[PDB]
């Protein structure tokens, strides 16, 4: 799964194609802002407020 070179393009064509699709099109995480720390403070622990 990690080294897709190990999947034979001749013996296993479909499985190789399915592996490279996952690596290139899986969704990318992102971030957004919320809250008002001036009054409510911040309760975040492992992330920035």
């Amino acid at each position: 799964f990690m080294n897709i070179q190990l999947i034979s393009p001749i013996d296993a064509p479909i499985l190789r194609q399915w592996a490279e699709i996952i690596h290139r099109y899986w969704p990318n995480p992102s971030q957004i802002r919320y809250g008002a720390p001036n009054v409510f403070g911040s309760a975040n622990l492992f992330t920035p407020p």
């Binding site: 080294n3 190990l6 013996d11």
Partner: protein
Amino acid sequence: VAVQLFRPLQGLVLDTQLYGFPGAFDDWERFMREKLRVLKYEVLRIYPISNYSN
């Protein structure tokens, strides 16, 4: 028409269909070269040459 196998490549004990080799000599040589390159890099991942040289 045939090829003699030295070491390594002395561990082919299964059916020929499982290996699925190309027919002609030149194609077989190429096929073996690309397939052996990946195995070389795989073993070098675990054993760096700078530490296990000898």
